[PDB]
Amino acid sequence: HMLWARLVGLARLEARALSKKERRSLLERLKPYYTRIPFSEKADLRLVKARTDSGEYEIITVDGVPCLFEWSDGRIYPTLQCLKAFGVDWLKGVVLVDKGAAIALAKGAHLMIPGVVGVEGSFTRGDVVAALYHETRTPVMVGVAEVDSSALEKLYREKARGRAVRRVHRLGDALWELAQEVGK
């Protein structure tokens, strides 16, 4: 197909079902990093490649929802659309942030410790976590923990300075815009 999205513009799409072998490899690549696989064995998984003016994006869809992507560190991460569809309980943890940090994250900033107001779950430095605006629990960013959850629980209470979560994907980024349109 073809689609036209904000920021990325016109995208030419090529989609196919994942093979039985790719589906198995996908589950094996997700297990080490999340509490559980969020989707069913009956869910239809497809690989969608979108070529835009700047380059190529590949997104794995789950029953048509653009949910997963491979980052430069070789791990598979969820899109925010994935979190809307399946929630966040399957993630090892989440970090709750204040309004100012939710707005900064939606502009593309990393999450600094003073913007944190709560920690949920249990995770260690390097784990995949999501940052949610505390008031509405809206996910605004997906990234990598810079500190263990137990350390963060202490650090945000002291309002220590420093980075809490390194941003990988966030609301309004090019992938998010493309995924929004794929979901339409």
C-alpha positions as CSV (number, residue, x, y, z in Angstrom):
1,H,0.0,0.0,0.0
2,M,0.9,3.7,0.4
3,L,0.2,6.2,3.2
4,W,1.0,9.8,3.9
5,A,2.0,10.8,7.4
6,R,2.9,13.8,9.3
7,L,6.7,14.5,9.4
8,V,7.7,11.5,7.3
9,G,5.4,12.3,4.4
10,L,4.6,9.8,1.7
11,A,5.5,6.2,2.5
12,R,5.5,3.2,0.1
13,L,4.6,0.1,2.0
14,E,5.5,-3.6,1.6
15,A,3.9,-6.0,4.1
16,R,4.1,-9.8,4.6
17,A,3.3,-12.4,7.3
18,L,6.1,-13.4,9.5
19,S,7.3,-17.0,8.9
20,K,6.8,-19.7,11.6
21,K,10.5,-19.5,12.3
22,E,10.5,-15.6,12.5
23,R,7.5,-15.7,14.9
24,R,9.4,-18.2,17.2
25,S,12.6,-16.1,17.0
26,L,10.5,-13.0,17.8
27,L,9.2,-14.6,21.0
28,E,12.6,-15.7,22.0
29,R,14.0,-12.2,21.5
30,L,11.2,-10.6,23.6
31,K,11.3,-13.0,26.6
32,P,14.5,-11.8,28.2
33,Y,13.3,-8.2,28.3
34,Y,9.7,-8.1,29.4
35,T,7.5,-9.6,32.0
36,R,5.5,-11.5,29.4
37,I,4.6,-11.6,25.7
38,P,1.6,-9.2,25.5
39,F,-0.1,-10.9,22.5
40,S,-1.7,-14.2,21.9
41,E,-0.5,-17.2,19.9
42,K,-3.5,-16.6,17.7
43,A,-2.6,-12.9,17.0
44,D,-1.7,-12.3,13.3
45,L,1.9,-11.0,13.1
46,R,3.2,-9.1,10.0
47,L,6.3,-7.2,9.0
48,V,5.6,-3.8,7.4
49,K,8.5,-2.0,5.6
50,A,7.7,1.7,4.8
51,R,10.0,3.6,2.6
52,T,9.9,7.4,3.0
53,D,12.0,10.2,1.6
54,S,14.6,9.9,4.3
55,G,14.8,6.2,4.6
56,E,13.2,2.9,5.7
57,Y,11.2,1.9,8.8
58,E,10.2,-1.7,9.6
59,I,7.4,-2.3,12.1
60,I,5.9,-5.6,13.3
61,T,2.1,-5.4,13.4
62,V,0.0,-7.4,15.7
63,D,-3.6,-7.9,14.4
64,G,-2.9,-4.8,12.3
65,V,-1.7,-2.6,15.2
66,P,1.9,-1.2,14.7
67,C,3.5,-2.6,17.9
68,L,7.2,-3.5,17.7
69,F,10.4,-2.4,16.2
70,E,14.1,-3.3,16.2
71,W,16.4,-0.6,17.6
72,S,20.1,-0.1,16.8
73,D,21.1,-2.1,19.9
74,G,19.5,-5.1,18.3
75,R,16.6,-5.4,20.8
76,I,12.9,-5.2,20.0
77,Y,11.0,-2.3,21.6
78,P,7.2,-1.5,21.7
79,T,5.7,1.6,20.0
80,L,3.5,3.7,22.1
81,Q,0.6,2.4,20.0
82,C,1.6,-1.1,21.3
83,L,1.2,0.2,24.9
84,K,-2.2,1.7,24.1
85,A,-3.3,-1.7,22.8
86,F,-1.8,-4.0,25.4
87,G,-1.1,-1.7,28.4
88,V,2.1,-1.6,30.4
89,D,1.9,-4.4,32.9
90,W,3.9,-6.7,30.5
91,L,6.9,-4.3,30.8
92,K,9.3,-4.9,33.6
93,G,8.5,-1.5,34.9
94,V,7.4,2.0,34.3
95,V,8.4,5.4,35.6
96,L,5.7,8.0,36.4
97,V,6.6,11.6,35.6
98,D,5.4,15.1,36.3
99,K,3.6,17.3,33.7
100,G,6.8,19.3,32.9
101,A,8.7,16.0,32.2
102,A,5.8,14.6,30.2
103,I,5.9,17.7,27.9
104,A,9.7,17.6,27.6
105,L,9.5,13.9,26.7
106,A,6.9,14.6,24.1
107,K,9.4,17.1,22.6
108,G,12.1,14.4,22.5
109,A,14.0,14.9,25.7
110,H,15.5,12.2,27.9
111,L,13.9,11.7,31.3
112,M,15.9,13.3,34.1
113,I,15.5,12.2,37.7
114,P,13.9,15.4,39.1
115,G,10.9,14.9,36.6
116,V,10.2,11.5,38.2
117,V,7.3,11.1,40.7
118,G,6.9,7.4,41.0
119,V,8.4,4.0,40.1
120,E,6.4,0.8,39.3
121,G,7.7,-2.7,38.8
122,S,11.2,-4.0,39.2
123,F,14.0,-3.5,36.7
124,T,17.7,-3.0,36.4
125,R,19.9,-0.5,34.6
126,G,19.6,-1.4,30.8
127,D,16.0,-2.8,31.0
128,V,13.3,-1.5,28.7
129,V,10.8,0.7,30.5
130,A,8.1,3.3,29.6
131,A,7.6,6.8,31.0
132,L,3.9,7.7,31.8
133,Y,2.5,11.1,32.7
134,H,1.3,10.3,36.3
135,E,-2.0,12.1,36.2
136,T,-3.6,10.3,33.2
137,R,-1.1,7.4,33.0
138,T,-0.6,8.3,29.4
139,P,2.6,6.7,28.0
140,V,4.8,9.4,26.5
141,M,8.1,7.6,25.9
142,V,9.8,4.2,25.7
143,G,13.4,3.8,26.6
144,V,16.2,2.3,28.6
145,A,16.6,2.5,32.3
146,E,19.8,4.3,33.3
147,V,19.6,3.1,36.9
148,D,18.0,0.2,38.7
149,S,14.4,0.6,40.0
150,S,15.5,0.4,43.6
151,A,18.0,3.1,43.1
152,L,15.5,5.3,41.2
153,E,13.0,5.0,44.1
154,K,15.6,6.6,46.3
155,L,16.9,9.1,43.8
156,Y,13.6,10.7,42.7
157,R,12.7,11.1,46.4
158,E,15.9,13.2,46.9
159,K,15.3,14.9,43.5
160,A,18.9,14.0,42.6
161,R,20.1,15.3,39.3
162,G,20.9,13.1,36.3
163,R,19.4,10.9,33.6
164,A,16.8,8.4,34.7
165,V,15.7,6.9,31.3
166,R,17.4,7.2,28.0
167,R,14.8,7.9,25.3
168,V,14.4,5.5,22.4
169,H,10.9,6.3,21.1
170,R,8.5,9.1,22.1
171,L,5.2,10.7,21.4
172,G,5.4,12.7,18.1
173,D,8.7,11.3,16.9
174,A,9.0,10.2,13.2
175,L,8.3,6.5,14.1
176,W,5.2,7.5,16.2
177,E,3.8,9.6,13.3
178,L,4.3,6.8,10.8
179,A,2.8,4.2,13.3
180,Q,-0.2,6.5,13.8
181,E,-1.0,6.5,10.2
182,V,-0.4,2.7,9.8
183,G,-2.9,2.2,12.6
184,K,-5.5,4.4,10.7
